[PDB]
Amino acid sequence: SWPICKRNGLPVCGETCTLGTCSTQGCTC
Numbered sequence: 001s002w003p004i005c006k007r008n009g010l011p012v013c014g015e016t017c018t019l020g021t022c023s024t025q026g027c028t029c
Contacts (some may be wrong), residue, residue, distance in 0.1 A: 003018060
């Protein structure tokens with residue numbers, strides 16, 4: 001959910017991607 005990041009559609013990643021991709025491996029903006 002760019003900018004916000006979400007794995008299964010929930011606030012679990014706790015991060016904000018600014019390049020169209022979460023900093024982690026498994027989450028989806």
